[PDB]
Design a binder for this molecule. Structure first.
Ligand SMILES: NC(=O)c1ccc[n+]([C@@H]2O[C@H](COP(=O)([O-])OP(=O)(O)OC[C@H]3O[C@@H](n4cnc5c(N)ncnc54)[C@H](O)[C@@H]3O)[C@@H](O)[C@H]2O)c1
Ligand SMILES: NC(=O)c1ccc[n+]([C@@H]2O[C@H](COP(=O)([O-])OP(=O)(O)OC[C@H]3O[C@@H](n4cnc5c(N)ncnc54)[C@H](O)[C@@H]3O)[C@@H](O)[C@H]2O)c1
Ligand SMILES: NC(=O)c1ccc[n+]([C@@H]2O[C@H](COP(=O)([O-])OP(=O)(O)OC[C@H]3O[C@@H](n4cnc5c(N)ncnc54)[C@H](O)[C@@H]3O)[C@@H](O)[C@H]2O)c1
Ligand SMILES: NC(=O)c1ccc[n+]([C@@H]2O[C@H](COP(=O)([O-])OP(=O)(O)OC[C@H]3O[C@@H](n4cnc5c(N)ncnc54)[C@H](O)[C@@H]3O)[C@@H](O)[C@H]2O)c1
Ligand SMILES: O[C@H](COc1ccc2c(c1)CCC2)Cn1cnc2ccccc21
Ligand SMILES: O[C@H](COc1ccc2c(c1)CCC2)Cn1cnc2ccccc21
Lengths: 267, 267, 267, 267
């Protein structure tokens, strides 16, 4: 297995459509022993994670809760066993209130909402690394999920800004992680039809917003030299596992694009 | 003059070492009619702005104060006269608490501090554009100040993250501004010996922090094919005035580097 | 005038639709004294340049002709007068045989054709700088024309590769130019309806190639926050003049995008 | 093994210090069946490739020789068996005459020399893909070797330009390759102490050139958050094998940096 014997924490499962669910599934397929973290709907997440190939401890983690972060390393160690450390960490956490993303005008997002989104989507990458680097092994890997924010685009609005901030945070986390012999990287994924995305295409945010996302997806598959299937999360999960493995050992502070090559093509 | 007859709002003067002071001076030299905004210490900044070549109304603007932002367009119009609009806006505002920039470890910055720095340094570019675009003329120009954050570096820490966010914000502000026939761009400046920077070189943050910024400056001038004089703000001021002028009419959502070409050279 | 008293060499006029023709016209409008260079069709170019606002010496320059390059500085000095030097140089020269650009498959371009295109479009920027830096004044400016090649695209093929090479060459020319107190930069322009482009939209290269360029142009104006008028070269000429002026004094080895902000927007 | 059962062509072995030698070794360790190509000194390179873990056919390929390219697919098929195709191709080929790289002034490189370097270092990536895509399986992978040319630097001169061109070529090769379900990517490696590089550090190009590459290496390891050991090619070889594997299936037209994260850090 690509990740045989590795202990990997995976955050961000809320449904079986979560990118984190597929990351977890592929990692287990490849021999990893997981610890999972979830937020808020733990009963729901327990039932979901029971559908993974293998058993894994589930720990509560609200990244805005300072006490959860302060206790996380101790709680992980209790879950994986004293004398064991993590080899991998997956951050698959993002949030921006609908005032900052969707149909609301860019200028009408109140800062308190933007600030909450940046806390969860960008700052928390640093706070999770702070909590977990003390219990990570040399050769380990931290991976976060990104959406290429180098150009502006309709609807994504302040979530784009949060991803820009995340990319910056990743480069600083790499500095810290390197002291432990750990890599930090992001995977910038193409669009994936989560339940939220399928609701928007179906008209949840109105006719315009539905047309804009359809146009995004059509164009994405068009530009990608190898195509892009927004219904298939597996290529993204595999890429995360590649970064968690020993096969990209000289890559850190970086961004790997799992997007069909769309970002390399203008039209 | 390059800016003859243009009405330009300039924020961010606090001392005569402020980059905004030099922007204001060069703009007035080139025929612009200015409106100034200042934060907190208005009596102090009145005495500073009295040293500009020409008189200009000074308005209070704390960018975290929703009431100041709601009233700003009306107060500007009162200053410049009913029926008149602005041709230019300069955002030269930045702030990050010392928990997020300087000698404090990257992981030890509390989010409340980071959030305040992002509010003032990045979000407020959008807030100022929201307030002022309704009173800007077609062909106008919004310019903000940047420090290239595409790579991590010592000390600058979360202010780097805030600049990464600002760059993303500028691309969205360009979308909104374009509806009014207005451009939005940032100038990424090399290091300038403001009073803060001269205090750091002089040892205010310790021997190490002093050594790091000296190494930055030495290396910057070395890499810059035309050199870089950190004691001369005029090249930066001129570049801002170039973007305020009619001579870059097809550039928006962009970043102009006034950095001696340092960012184009590895070594 | 923005360029009052400056002596500026402008290459690349072949018709009154050449971007170089508009650069020359705006520069003369702004007080510059020009020297023009042309290739091959000098009788044609003489009649064209007679339509500029003001008189200007026309010198022959085939950039692949080593003797033309070896004599160019002497010939310029003879044209502008002993004791006078240039303040500016415009490279507006590009060429790629139709085996390397248009409808021919990317893999079917013979290297001799690609090599000729790279010589003219990229290497010649260095060879013109070598010839002319010895007769340029401190504070001077060399500007070349670019088309953003950071992503692949239909049809442009090996001309894209040539522009990628040009961007690299510009960063090295900046190193050399800086020794003379001279800046080197490129202007990356959006698409402009030259006679060649209008022929292609009209069907000269077939129905597919016509549809692809139409799609390029439509999308360009759509993405640009301030729009993009492919029939109007003036915004590009002005940007070149901004770089030739004293108002971007700290920018070198760089690329300024005169493209309506299209490259900053995904959709 | 990571590459179990895959048939992979590897070019660019000339010594056991070649990056291609290590790529070949790691690929064989991971179960790949190789076909090797060599230039000029086949008897010499037979003796070198005899030191790989396993036997592999060695085919002659001078990438400037049109007849070698025309026959290559047939010769590969003969080696691997009728009905069998390649799953991977490695381009590890580079060349720039000393007039274009080293101690010679940038402006003193004759175009004939630059053109030869671009032919071998950049164009041949396309030529090899043209020859081999017709005998590549869906899901296959083409990988070329890069040195980040986004910024200028001492000494590397026109080889930097050739790498800039290669990066552009890779994005076009991705377009073609995608028609076959094949990916095309480059690995941008940090500096590796090949026999050429060790000769330069030892003084072969003079005291200055020696001092410049020592300064490069020192700075590279300093900037890299996980360090950079120029005497260890294995991290680079592994990264190439990661791209040859099934674990980066949605990455194409792209660049993976196996450089210790140096390019993500300013200082
Ligand atoms: N869906 C796409 O098209 C796409 C593509 C690129 C990358 N991404 C990124 O992938 C990641 C996963 O998103 P997804 O598409 O799987 O959506 P999702 O809604 O399934 O996942 C987001 C996760 O963040 C968690 N979260 C929210 N607030 C939290 C908090 N306070 N503490 C801890 N966890 C919290 C949610 O519970 C959820 O599990 C995000 O970072 C997202 O921005 C999404
Ligand atoms: N000095 C440098 O080396 C350098 C280089 C690159 C860019 N910059 C940028 O230039 C801009 C100006 O900084 P500077 O170096 O002239 O320093 P400065 O301290 O003189 O300017 C910062 C300004 O921001 C104002 N400000 C802070 N909080 C505010 C608030 N709540 N509301 C309104 N205004 C507020 C301050 O009063 C001050 O006038 C900043 O964005 C900075 O990041 C600085
Ligand atoms: N037209 C566009 O859409 C567009 C946009 C971006 C930039 N550009 C670039 O702008 C520049 C000017 O192109 P244009 O659109 O004005 O087309 P053009 O055909 O008018 O100009 C190209 C010029 O190169 C000259 N040239 C060719 N071979 C030469 C040689 N051996 N020696 C000297 N001069 C030689 C030609 O005579 C001609 O004057 C080029 O570098 C082009 O690639 C074009
Ligand atoms: N050494 C480094 O620091 C470094 C770092 C980044 C990337 N690279 C790249 O890695 C690749 C391999 O270089 P290397 O350092 O292993 O050196 P090397 O000299 O061992 O490899 C270069 C290879 O190119 C081959 N070659 C030259 N002309 C050829 C032709 N006409 N036809 C076919 N093959 C030809 C040579 O025989 C040799 O095998 C190159 O692209 C190089 O730019 C090198
Ligand atoms: O020490 C820093 C001063 O800048 C910088 C920026 C970049 C780099 C360094 C220092 C070291 C190498 C890279 C942070 N910092 C702390 N207080 C400050 C007040 C004003 C401005 C900056 C301030
Ligand atoms: O000297 C150079 C050796 O590389 C490099 C690369 C980058 C940089 C330097 C040197 C100095 C700082 C930046 C060119 N060079 C000359 N002969 C060579 C043979 C093999 C490889 C390179 C060769």
């Amino acid at each position: 297995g690509l990740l045989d014997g590795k202990r990997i924490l995976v955050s961000g499962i809320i449904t079986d459509s979560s990118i984190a669910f597929h990351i977890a599934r592929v990692a287990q397929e490849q021999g990893a022993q997981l610890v999972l973290t979830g937020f808020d709907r733990l009963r729901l997440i327990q039932r979901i994670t029971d559908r993974l190939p293998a058993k894994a401890p589930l720990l509560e983690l609200d990244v805005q809760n300072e006490e959860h972060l302060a206790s996380l390393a101790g709680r992980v160690t209790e879950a994986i066993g004293a004398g064991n450390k993590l080899d991998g960490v997956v951050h698959s956490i993002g949030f921006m209130p609908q005032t900052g993303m969707g149909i609301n005008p860019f200028f009408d997002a109140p800062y308190a909402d933007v600030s909450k989104g940046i806390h969860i989507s960008a700052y928390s990458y640093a706070s999770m690394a702070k909590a977990l680097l003390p219990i990570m092994n040399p050769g380990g890997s931290i991976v976060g999920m990104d959406f290429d924010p180098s150009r502006a685009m309709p609807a994504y609005n302040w979530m784009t800004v949060a991803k820009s901030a995340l990319e910056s945070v990743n480069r600083f986390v790499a500095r810290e992680a390197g002291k432990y012999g750990v890599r930090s990287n992001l995977v910038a994924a193409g669009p994936i039809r989560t339940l939220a995305m399928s609701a928007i295409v179906g008209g949840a945010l109105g006719e315009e917003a539905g047309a804009q996302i359809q146009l995004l997806e059509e164009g994405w598959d068009q530009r990608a030299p190898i195509g892009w299937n927004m219904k298939d999360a597996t290529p993204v999960a595999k890429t995360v596992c590649a970064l968690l493995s020993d096969w990209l050992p000289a890559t850190t502070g970086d961004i790997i694009y799992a997007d069909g090559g769309a970002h390399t093509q203008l039209l």
